[PDB]
Amino acid sequence: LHTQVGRGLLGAVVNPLGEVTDKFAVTDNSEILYRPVDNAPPLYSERAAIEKPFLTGIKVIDSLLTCGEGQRMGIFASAGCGKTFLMNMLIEHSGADIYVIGLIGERGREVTETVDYLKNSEKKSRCVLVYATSDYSSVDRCNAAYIATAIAEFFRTEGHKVALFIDSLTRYARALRDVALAAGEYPVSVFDSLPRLLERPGKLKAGGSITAFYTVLLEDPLAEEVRSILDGHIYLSRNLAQKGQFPAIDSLKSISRVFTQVVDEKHRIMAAAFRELLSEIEELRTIIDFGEYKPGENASQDKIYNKISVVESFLKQDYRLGFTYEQTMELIGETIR
């Protein structure tokens, strides 16, 4: 019902009981406070409008799927489309003050993977990790989500720009379902914990912000209405991963619902122009695989064909590399020209 919060948790690993069990970094700060894990979402009047971009350093995201400070973004993928590696990129190449990661229902190898990743990360001293493995109860998995959010909420009230990661909402949802049948399942369900959890992030007028990334596993009914609640979603295409396209983000099947609110007109024009070229390329891919593309016949098709490699090159991104907003807009500029 209460968890540890504060700068003293920076660099630490926290189990579903709110106790530190490991560290991936050590900091000079030792601030430890206590707050409840279940807190009310901000009043609408307390919430600031999402107007400022949350840069990720990932070209396809920053250019076509631009995130906003205080936004909730879904990450939809089937294991493995490189979901974990996308999250790692989001941590490395963004510029948040503090990163809070909640790993829900992960095998435990997996938990150690994230820890070993953080142990060599440059963001190590700005991260807090909360985990719940497959060996913990369904109640403990749910609390892992609340603890991570509550930890993030404290940093937000201090005015920090916080990025919250929940991997995954899928395993969290199962745990919630198992908990629901406990006590045999007015006016409180166990099923409604999911919206309460998701409306907690955001930018506060009086405080910092929480930009949250919720991962959803694909193999689902409420995968479709976690989508309904959030402010956008990123889809990792299995097709794109197998073609060696990394990150395997399907731009055309993804959206940031705050896109036009966080980029200027010049950006908006380039993005729209890029998406059309993308659509034209997909049309040609079909025509090619149908065996109806002969060079020389249609000048427009030939012009589109010769744009495929530069477009693919723009979408491609080494996971170790991060791009500034000026670089991304510069690159997409030569792609559509």
From Swiss-Prot:
GO biological process, any: protein secretion by the type III secretion system
Family classification: Belongs to the ATPase alpha/beta chains family. T3SS ATPase subfamily.
Free-text function comment from the UniProt entry: ATPase component of the type III secretion system (T3SS), also called injectisome, which is used to inject bacterial effector proteins into eukaryotic host cells. Acts as a molecular motor to provide the energy that is required for the export of proteins. Required for type III secretion apparatus (T3SA) formation, proper protein secretion, host cell invasion and virulence. May play a critical role in T3SS substrate recognition, disassembly of the effector/chaperone complex and unfolding of the effector in an ATP-dependent manner prior to secretion.
Record flagged with keyword Protein transport: yes
Inhibition and activation profile: Oligomerization increases ATPase activity. Monomeric forms exhibit low-level ATPase activity by forming short-lived oligomers with active site contributions from at least two protomers. In contrast, oligomers exhibit enhanced ATP hydrolysis rates that likely result from multiple preformed active sites within the oligomeric complex. Oligomerization is important for both enzyme activation and T3SS function.
Consequence of changing residue 81 to V: No change in ATPase activity
GO molecular function terms noted in the UniProt entry: ATP binding; ATP hydrolysis activity; identical protein binding; protein-exporting ATPase activity; proton-transporting ATP synthase activity, rotational mechanism
Effect of residue 199 to A: Reduces oligomerization. Lack of ATPase activity. Exhibits moderate invasion and hemolysis levels. Low levels of secreted IpaC
Shown segment, full-protein numbering: 83 to 430 of 430
Enzymatic reactions: ATP + H2O + cellular proteinSide 1 = ADP + phosphate + cellular proteinSide 2
GO cellular component: cytoplasm; type III protein secretion system complex
Localization terms from the record: Cytoplasm
Effect on the protein of changing residue 219 to A: Slight decrease in ATPase activity
Domain of life: Bacteria
Protein name: Type 3 secretion system ATPase
Keywords assigned: ATP-binding, Cytoplasm, Nucleotide-binding, Plasmid, Protein transport, Translocase, Transport, Virulence
